[PDB]
Amino acid sequence: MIINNLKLIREKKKISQSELAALLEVSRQTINGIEKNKYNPSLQLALKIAYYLNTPLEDIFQWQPE
Amino acid sequence: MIINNLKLIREKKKISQSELAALLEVSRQTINGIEKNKYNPSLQLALKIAYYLNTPLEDIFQWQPE
16 A cells, blocks of 8 residues: 655645656656556656655655555 | 665664565565665565665665766
8 A cells, every 4th residue: 555645745845747757857747647646656766756855755655554 | 876775774673684575575585686786676665665674765775866
């Protein structure tokens, strides 16, 4: 079980999906897909998300046993 | 590039590779490959590692910003 807070966090900071995608060098569609729970990023992309949002990764992606 | 600290953290906690593998429900080969820098884990496995090692994930898996 993984809870995802990416949209909430990104929105809290008034960053749009396009600026975050440009920082990450991914498509805006990929950020949107991750925000909508459609698929998970690789660990490195997840760490880059956390970096660019200045947020601990586990506040963005919450895994819980079960 | 991700630098990981899994071996040192695991060893400090006195956890063997087979022990960690059992807890995470992965093979020992998987654990060893992460520690030998072959295998980065998936996001889910990284989250499970951080959860059970009671360590912030970014202290275990450190993206080198680029």
